[PDB]
Symmetry: C3
């Protein structure tokens, strides 16, 4: 999928996560977040496909997206070890990270 | 997974999509479709594993499967921008494409 | 994701599978299992990251994880051809395999 679709999916699943009371739905949505990050691992924001592969702007985007995926994985492990509320705290921190990465290349 | 399992998953999720009233279940099933296409990206239909890698039949199969994945991504973006019904219209068009690709190598 | 998170996800989805009466939830959880195996395809158990890439211990781990993924795919095809209960029988056999692979490198 494209960058915008995946970022909106991440925000959607974050909305689904804060309204969760059991780790089942939590872990499900977190794995959907990791899924959306995996499908759009090479996607490019509409803001800057006309940039070179070794451009520091592009590398900024790439490492930020990797950061997203890594933070998702940490929250997934939290939701796997049983802790349904600590996973949601990590999910709100992830929401901060997702907000930043999206608002940087949203338009 | 194998080609047949993934194509039946696509048809199943298409059946789940037309009975949807909110973008949440829609986007969920569409991402499951993209997932099934990602897991079976190198799968071969039972009809023609005894073909060469550069055989135009095989390349036909490959580009058709890529077409499936791309059309799924477009429907996913539609279901991400909020439009739950335009996503279902794109999903019925995708159902046409999925029907063709499956009935070409079903047996 | 990491090995432990993915293995706990597999066990969780196995728990969700045995309580299933329709192939919809079955196939959904099985595809989540294949998803978790795909995300952690290169993950390393906490027990043995300090091993060489060509170490037979590491290769044992790798082929066992591939075995997990393959058995998941077989169960997914069973759950796709309509057979909701034969898929659950294959899922309990998969539970045996998952138990072994997890208890080998759990700590
Ligand atoms: Co992949």
């Amino acid at each position: 999928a494209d960058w915008e679709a995946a970022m909106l999916t991440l925000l959607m699943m974050l909305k689904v996560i804060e309204k969760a009371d059991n780790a089942a739905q939590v872990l499900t949505a977190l794995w959907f977040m990791a899924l959306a990050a995996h499908m759009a691992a090479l996607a490019t924001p509409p803001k800057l496909e006309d940039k070179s592969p070794a451009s520091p702007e592009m590398i900024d985007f790439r490492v930020g997206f990797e950061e997203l995926a890594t933070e998702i994985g940490k929250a997934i492990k939290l939701a796997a070890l049983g802790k349904v509320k600590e996973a949601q705290a990590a999910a709100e921190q992830l929401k901060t990270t997702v907000n930043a990465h999206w608002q940087k290349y949203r338009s």
